Structures are given as C-alpha cells and as structure tokens.
Write a protein that binds this DNA or RNA. Structure first.
Ligand SMILES: Nc1ncnc2c1ncn2[C@H]1C[C@H](O)[C@@H](COP(=O)(O)OP(=O)(O)OP(=O)(O)O)O1
Ligand SMILES: [Ca+2]
Ligand SMILES: [Ca+2]
Length: 341
DNA sequence: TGGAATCCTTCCCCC
DNA sequence: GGGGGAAGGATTCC
C-alpha cells in the first residue's frame, strides 16, 4: 500500500497567470463579486505573492484591498479552471487507473501496481510534477504515504511546489507529534471539542473510553481518528460521482418579499438545469442564507425525475415554507438538485 | 462567495 | 427493537 496525492498550487490564481504570464511576480487575488456594493464579495484564492501578507480565501474583498491596494483583482472564471483541471486529470489517468478525483484540484493515485518503494515513488512524483509543468505550465505539490490521509498531510507540509514522502516510521512519530487540528476532517468545531476532552495529539485518542468520544464528536468521526491512530486507516481510492448540483446567488438587498426573491430563485434554477445536462434529479432543495448568515433549507423528494416547469413551481412552495417558518430576512437564495436517475 | 460531500439527529411508518 | 426512509441541520473542505 502506497498512495500518491497531487495538489495544484494556488490553483485559480495560477491558472489566471498561465493565461496571462505578465501576472507572474505580482500579487494576484481571484475574487467572487457579490455585486451588492462596490467590491462586495469574498476572496476565492490568491497566489503566494498575495498570500504572504494575509490575503487568503474567505476574507472579504474590501479587507484584501486595505492590505494590498495595488494587487491584481480578477473575477472568478470557473468554467475555465474547470477545463484546465480536466486536462490535467487526464494526464494522471495514464499514470494509474486507480484514481480518485477529490476536488477541482486534488487527486490521489494508487500506485502499488506501478512502483516498488518510496524511492521509485518519489521518482514517479517528479516524473509527474514535470509532465504537468511541461504540458500545462502549472506547478503542483505531491505528497506520498501508505494511505490517503497521510499523503494529503505530506502535501500540506511540502507546499508550494513541493514533493514529500512520509514513510512508515515518520507516520509513527506524527501520530504522537501532529496537532490533531491538522488532521483532514477536523475543523474548528471538532478541534475545540477535542481540546476540552484532553486530546491535542492524534495519540490521545486511545486514552479515552470510546463511548465518551462517540458522545462528543460522533461515531463515524471517532472510528476515523481511532483507526488513524492505530496505524490502521486504509480506505481505498474510489471513483466518486456527483451526488448533487446547485446554485446559490446573492440578492442586491435582504428581503422577505416573495416577488422580490423569485427571480433570483429562477435564475438559480436555470443555471442549475443547464449544469445538469442530461441528468435527471428526483430531489429539489431550496437553500436560504438568512440575514445573520444562518442557513435554513427546505426540500422534497419525488417518485419521478423533475422537469423544469415542475422545478419552477415546487421551488416557490418550499421558499414559502421558509418565509412562513423563519422570521428573518434573506441574503442569499438558491437550489440544489440531488438523487439522479 | 459559492459549491458539494457526509455525517447526525429526529421523525415517521411498520413488521 | 429494529430496518428503511426522508428531512433538516451541522461540519468540513476546496
Ligand atoms: N473558501 C473558498 N471560497 C471559494 N473558492 C475556494 C475556497 N477555497 C478553495 N477554493 C477554490 C479555489 C482554490 O484555488 C481551489 C483549491 O483550493 P486549495 O487546494 O485548498 O488551495 P489553493 O489551490 O488556492 O492553494 P494552495 O496551494 O495553498 O492549496 O478551490
Ligand atoms: Ca492546492
Ligand atoms: Ca483544521
């Protein structure tokens, strides 16, 4: 068992660089304009030029202009990055058949049937970093170990433009040494529960009675951290498929009025239906982001697939259900479509 | 901001 | 008691 994990660096920004090389050397910030005010929006990502000054994914765009008033700010062109990504995936598909496409910018490859050890793996690493640098002009970080979680961690250490092997002895210290907050799947809310439980490192997971751990963070998560800690996590590489498709959009004002919201909602369905493209959903959800950034959703499953005129009419009922059941104003509104035939 | 997975808890119908 | 749903929310990650 030997897993290789690949992670395209500062991806959306690097793609705008590849597309206009003049941009190299300059701090680049790829933004998502919400279009309420001027520069209402958030940061989708920035190159390391910008990132070293605090500008990063999820700070408002106004906050990023106060730090770097002369950086280059580009609106997000997703469809573009979506295609460049595909082309690269295809490249890796020739390095192995066992390949999990994790996100727009990550993939793990099972390379047992291709390689004999951590030296031969390394070489395959550089063989690939190179081939992507060559064909597509994009730098990636490569992390390597016995499973996916440690391949990913390896990569976090080695970024950007890095390559790294975490071998079976280094995994051993890391269970003791690694801060559990730095484990994939443990976000701020689990990190805090785990601290008040006495777990700051991966290895303190064993010192607790399981059923207390289950009681704090869930079973699924508890079994995960446990197996990880017993050098015993070993989930395989899967070809995961889209389970849902949707679209959420921001209104120029916060509103409670049904006629004010509807056309935002209809545009969301429209784009959603395009994105489906010969896919037929059985489930529609209406998601609202209320004025204080809380998220409330109402939905419905059908026995048949959903056509557009049915998605139109049913979506308005579920939005009604939200206004009725929740007293707050509405900042964002959209749809998600799941349960494909 | 915008997208999408997965888990958990609760409710329900019913052997 | 338990299987099998669905629905709504919570959490994470990119
Ligand atoms: N919070 C976000 N909001 C919008 N888009 C995001 C967000 N996070 C990530 N993305 C998008 C843009 C990123 O380029 C892409 C990949 O994310 P990610 O791999 O974590 O970091 P990154 O590619 O920007 O740089 P890095 O090399 O540091 O990981 O997904
Ligand atoms: Ca990356
Ligand atoms: Ca974290």
């Amino acid at each position: 068992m030997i897993v290789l994990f690949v992670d395209f660096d500062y991806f959306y920004a690097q793609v705008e660089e590849v597309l206009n090389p003049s941009l190299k050397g300059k701090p680049v910030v790829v933004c998502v304009f919400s279009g309420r005010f001027e520069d209402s929006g958030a940061v989708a990502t920035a190159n390391y030029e910008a990132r070293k000054f605090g500008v990063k994914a999820g700070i408002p765009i106004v906050e990023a202009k106060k730090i770097l008033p002369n950086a280059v700010y580009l609106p997000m062109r997703k469809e573009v990055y979506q295609q460049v990504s595909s082309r690269i995936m295809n490249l890796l598909r020739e390095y192995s058949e066992k390949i999990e496409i994790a996100s727009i910018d990550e993939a793990y490859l099972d390379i047992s049937d291709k390689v004999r050890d951590y030296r031969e793996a390394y070489n395959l690493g550089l063989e690939i970093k190179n081939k992507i640098l060559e064909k597509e002009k994009i730098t990636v970080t490569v992390g390597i170990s016995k499973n996916k979680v440690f391949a990913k961690i390896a990569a976090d250490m080695a970024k950007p433009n890095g390559i790294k092997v975490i071998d079976d002895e280094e995994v051993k210290r890391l269970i003791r040494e690694l801060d559990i907050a730095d484990v994939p799947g443990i976000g701020n809310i689990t990190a805090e529960k785990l601290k008040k439980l006495g777990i700051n490192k991966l290895v303190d997971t064993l010192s607790i009675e399981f059923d207390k751990l289950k009681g704090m963070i869930g079973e699924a998560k508890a079994k995960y951290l446990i197996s990880l800690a017993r050098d015993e996590y070993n989930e395989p590489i899967r070809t995961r498929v889209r389970k849902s498709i949707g679209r959420i959009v921001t209104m120029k004002r916060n509103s409670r009025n049904l006629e004010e919201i509807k056309p935002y909602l209809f545009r969301a369905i429209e784009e959603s239906y395009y994105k489906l493209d010969k896919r037929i959903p059985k489930a529609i959800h209406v998601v609202a982001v209320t004025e204080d950034l809380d998220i409330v959703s109402r939905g419905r499953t059908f026995p048949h697939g959903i056509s557009k005129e049915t998605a139109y009419s049913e979506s308005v009922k579920l939005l009604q259900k939200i206004l009725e059941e929740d007293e707050r104003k509405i900042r964002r509104i959209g749809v998600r479509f799941s349960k494909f035939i």
